[PDB]
Design an enzyme around this catalytic site. Structure first.
Site: not given
Ligand SMILES: CCC(CC)CN(C[C@@H](O)[C@H](Cc1ccccc1)NC(=O)O[C@H]1CO[C@H]2OCC[C@H]21)S(=O)(=O)c1ccc(N)cc1
Lengths: 99, 99
Positions: B25-27
């Site tokens: 997860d690059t995000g």
């Molecule tokens: C602040 C930037 C993002 C949120 C915007 C940070 N996220 C990582 C992100 O990849 C998250 C990781 C994630 C993946 C799956 C379920 C919950 C979180 N994916 C996510 O929210 O994606 C959403 C949009 O596309 C959809 O597919 C996945 C969920 C929806 S996170 O999960 O909230 C996160 C925040 C801080 C840390 N240290 C580790 C992870």
């Protein structure tokens, strides 16, 4: 280009004729941008993140340019903490992970 | 290797002698793993994303092996819906984005 991950992978995007900063997010299935006015029709949808579910407006078949690469796909608009580019668009610009 | 993004970038990891599936997860700034009973001291933390915040336990200098690549760093543990490998460990395995 090749992007290392010592800093957040932030890039400039162009959507609806406006420039914005966005995060390349391989952990996101979908692309979610902060509140903004986009032209065209939209439908209400729900998406879930690490902290629960939010309400978003779903815009389909939107043109969006990411570092000079054109994509046309679904863009969700809602109270995301930050603009994220998800796999639905990363695939279109030919993005892969490599190690 | 090269991982395309047609599907979620799930890989097998090894932590505390256990094998798990986790998202590259690059995000994510920092690695967060599903609730597990890791030994040693920890510090409470809250991390934010779509939907709000979750409370997590921050462990330091935790060894994780990702597809044979070893990496040691911070690992957060809490009620995340998915195991997430974040940039803090992705840099250590030489993982880049490429398009
Ligand atoms: C602040 C930037 C993002 C949120 C915007 C940070 N996220 C990582 C992100 O990849 C998250 C990781 C994630 C993946 C799956 C379920 C919950 C979180 N994916 C996510 O929210 O994606 C959403 C949009 O596309 C959809 O597919 C996945 C969920 C929806 S996170 O999960 O909230 C996160 C925040 C801080 C840390 N240290 C580790 C992870």
């Amino acid at each position: 280009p090749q992007i290392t991950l010592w800093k957040r992978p932030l890039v400039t995007i162009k959507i609806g004729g406006q420039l914005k900063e966005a995060l390349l997010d391989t952990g996101a299935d979908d692309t979610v941008l902060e509140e903004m006015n986009l032209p065209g029709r939209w439908k209400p949808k729900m998406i879930g993140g690490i902290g629960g579910f939010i309400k978003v407006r779903q815009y389909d078949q939107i043109l969006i340019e990411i570092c000079g690469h054109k994509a046309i796909g679904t863009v969700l608009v809602g109270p995301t903490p930050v603009n994220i580019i998800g796999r639905n668009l990363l695939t279109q610009i030919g993005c892969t992970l490599n190690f």
